[model samples]
Target: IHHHHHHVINLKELKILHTSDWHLGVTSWTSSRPVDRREELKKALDKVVEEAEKREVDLILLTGDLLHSRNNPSVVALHDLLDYLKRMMRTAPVVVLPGNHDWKGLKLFGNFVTSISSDITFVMSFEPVDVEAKRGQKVRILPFPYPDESEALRKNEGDFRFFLESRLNKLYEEALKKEDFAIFMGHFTVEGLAGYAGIEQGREIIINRALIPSVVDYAALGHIHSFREIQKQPLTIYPGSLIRIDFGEEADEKGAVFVELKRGEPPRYERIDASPLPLKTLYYKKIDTSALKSIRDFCRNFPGYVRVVYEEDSGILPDLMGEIDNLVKIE
Candidate 1:
């Protein structure tokens, strides 16, 4: 382990707009509350861009899941996404990672963006790349997009954790060797965070804290839809999704993170709310399930998205289903 309490470090004071999980093109599968999800997502996105400019941040870091479709992202949403990035790039340099939802398609999109713009770094690789000195700080960025299992699982004989730990540790070691401040941009689940509802086994790769070497300065991660801080010293953070994709994320506060950093000091961070569309759940517990006629009225007239929690055996689920597609009490 190389230890450098070196003084010439002369760290620069820098501001960063950290955000993730845009998930463009995603729509509510079961809600027909006459609300446009993409439109709301854009509204939330607007606040993010405005914050970037208002704060005059030097860098904009997006962890992953910018697009929703795994195979092909919607052209219309792509247009809006590109347009927004155009605005953001004008203010500060932008860095992006592709989450599982983005898949292989983003590689081409990212490459195209990188080719056209010097201010945008669409990191499509697992290797380390440098976002050279902005003010006295040289940043070494390590990107961990949603791994292609075929690539990650092959060399280590399917030992996923081994490959993960060894690779990250080795990369951080390399970063520490340089004078740059290191940031690990990753998209995966940490061992213990509030995960998604009905989280499937083997669907997500869990990142053990051990994989993160103490030497790394910052870990900007995504994949978990909720905003959480796993550590403070090195600042392991998930900025969370831009909006509530569904009722499963109703309680989550949607926003981006603003960060202030200097070498050898803990990062100072704050959350900027996107004023997400409210997701409320109503209830019909009585045997007389006819109360749902009013529930239907409330759902129709409610300003934001609404759902109902009725008796499972009420047998009126279809009745409520007829009113609104999104009826969830479980999640």
Candidate 2:
């Protein structure tokens, strides 16, 4: 258990920007230049930094997937990611927990205990970090990284879900003894919610809302790619990914959440509006000659990428591709 107390500005309401699932180091799924896709992720983070500064938030909670892969992160990608975290730390303290995609990246930090900066707290284990919020109030953050089933089984000698709930309950109970507020931050999927990012039923951690201790004022969740609230009272919020990475997420609203935590009251939160940013657009359709109607409609507001399918015998490939090519170029 690591403990660190830091200075916090005075305010009645603490503004926390809840965001996650960065999936950095990923290249464009369709673009020939994959590196260019990596640059777009950088741009997204740049916008995040800009928003954080503009809001003058008190804390930023990054739930995980800070990188695309554990195995092959680009050097420049790593530099850019680290640079963004450093820059955000300058504005407000940052707290990060690791997701499944961050397994190898978290390993690089090892078992050592130290701060990347005084304003940053990287929770790589199951520990309750006590953070001072505004007006001399304290927020007890129970941070949980994605658990390894084998290791968890070995440690608890019981069901994983029961063990996880017991641990969280214990932490919340302990925090109540000394802290003014409590928040649980984790990278896992809860039961009853539709899967996001291709996560299957067997792969999810399956934490039910009933299992969450009532002492917990708010739950900040990650791993799911869409912003959703699984519970209301003692709110459970998934801030979703900062930007859409694949065509599957084309319709998703890519942004973060703003949380205001005050002692003796329920935390109030709302989605942060981040529109008009250049997100990669994807259009997919299967059709015949009538597809031109869809194409013309798409031309009205073209995204970054588009694809359509039809029988080769239809003989529309040349015309369709050429028309889309010309229209997209003009946009």
Candidate 3:
């Protein structure tokens, strides 16, 4: 394991876990060769909580999409994960917010708090909610779902840009008030952070320069599977997903960001390894079926699942029940 410390504040260090894109219950199989990949993710998220415990964090900020769907099984999986994390709450406060996929709107799901415990502060609306940190920090949360149900907000690319510009400025102004620190957690996409490739379809939530006017201390964002840093601001970051739900997310390192926010200081963000077993990507250098050597040896001891993206498509790829390791998914 690699050990390095990241500092982001101006005062005494404060540690908290910031994680997003836990698309629990996301199905990886589409045919007879189907399997429950969410179970693997559940195990991974458990590891994240354990890491937070080891770090002795002060709070946990979960940026939504707790479940893939509002279905009963999905909700159950979501509940189980929350229950596990709540164990940490006995020590550190847990801040849970809703994403577009897990919005309060019935149009999206039954309700944001469907089967979850009522004790949790589920931010089901676009409005801001107050969250008093367990370690004595008074902060506010402005949560924007996938999109507004009333369609009251702008839709056009340019119009949307203008809207975020004006609103973010206001949010910043409010955050800069005396003695009160602030953080914005959302499950949307920002303009330049849509990612070079992969999970770009969910990039509808584009943020322009105006929304990030530099007063908000920290911006915890999600939705995109790969972790990313804001274009010009270290205050904003996308910690990425808990696990790989698809091969598209293979290149990205799956983990959560541990943010240390001290009063009167820039917040410190640390990327922690959350995968139960690392989702390492294996690639085929050449495309010949006969030349597809080391298929078994390459994956011989791999503990985690792999999505083999061949340099060129090949017919030599073994079936699910092949001579190699247990396959999770293939590209």
Candidate 4:
């Protein structure tokens, strides 16, 4: 493992774990496929908790998409997450921001007080939070949750980009006044990252690096499913998702990042793999039915999820269908 450590003169240091995109109800494509997803999510969460405890991190930066669906999230998954949060508080404070799929709980959380627990902070708006790490070390967090564009435009009198840039700049000014370690937590796409990552355009708010104010130690970003750093001058980073939830992301690694920041030095981070579930390689193939007589013969040694497209009509073969069962899906 390559660990980074940058030196600075007379700087007070803070340690943080950055993780995100816990699509809690996401399917694992297990033997029963989607049915076992919640159980798999719990296992992944357990791994995250274990890593936190092992590292003795001072804070947790959870970017967003905590739930698979806003309208209807899994009850079991919710319960497990809530339980984990309550337990995780003993280690370090966990800070969360809302993503595109997180609005359902955002509205409800907004009605509550500052926190669900003293150790967990839910960032619902563009505001600065003075988060306490260990031994009175303070890390100022500038949070910009995935904005509800329609609602924001309606409230701000119709200029989305202007309103957003102004708020972010204002927060940076506020952070500068404090003269402490500052981090920006956001759940939107920044310029020069989305297109490079092949992220679907027009579905998220995009902000330029120039618009991001200076003196910030790190930009902990979410909404992207792969771990990458878009800017290194001031350290804009995406720790990526906690688990692999779909075939589209079959090749992407699931992990968290451990960040260390000092007052006068550039921040350094290390990527830690936290996925407990094994990723199954997706196999897509078009088979000539005339060449292969038995589906059992074809899939005998296959170890991963399979999708087979037949050249001939083999749907009438009940034996072949029964042999494959939940092991493969016919396309």
In terms of lDDT, which candidate is strongest? 1
lDDT of each residue in 1-331, candidate 3, tens digit only: 4222223333344567888877776676455245566667777777787888898776677775666764344566767766765675655666666666433343333244433532246665656666655555556666655555323454666776666565666666666662455667776667655453334334356665346646656777776677887743537877878777665566778888888776666677778877545555556666455334555555677776655556665456556446545555455
lDDT, model 4, position 150: 55
Instruction: Write down the RMSD of candidate 3 (Cα, Å).
Output: 6.3
Native-to-model Cα distance after best TM-score fit, residue 19 in candidate 2, in Å: 1.1
* Candidate 2, pairs of clashing residues: none
What is the per-residue lDDT of model 1 for residues 294-328, given as tens digits with 9 covering 90 to 100? 67666675666666555655443444555465443
Q: After superposition, how far is residue 255 of candidate 1 from its true place, in Å?
A: 0.4
Candidate 2 lDDT tens digits, 98-169: 776433545556333234445667777787777654233566788766776644356543566567777777
| Model 2 clash number | 0
RMSD to native for every prediction? 6.0, 5.2, 6.3, 5.7
TM-scores, one per candidate: 0.83, 0.80, 0.77, 0.80
In candidate 4 the C-alpha lDDT for residue 116 amounts to: 43
Model 1 vs. true fold: TM: 0.83
Instruction: Note the residue pairs that clash in candidate 1.
Output: none
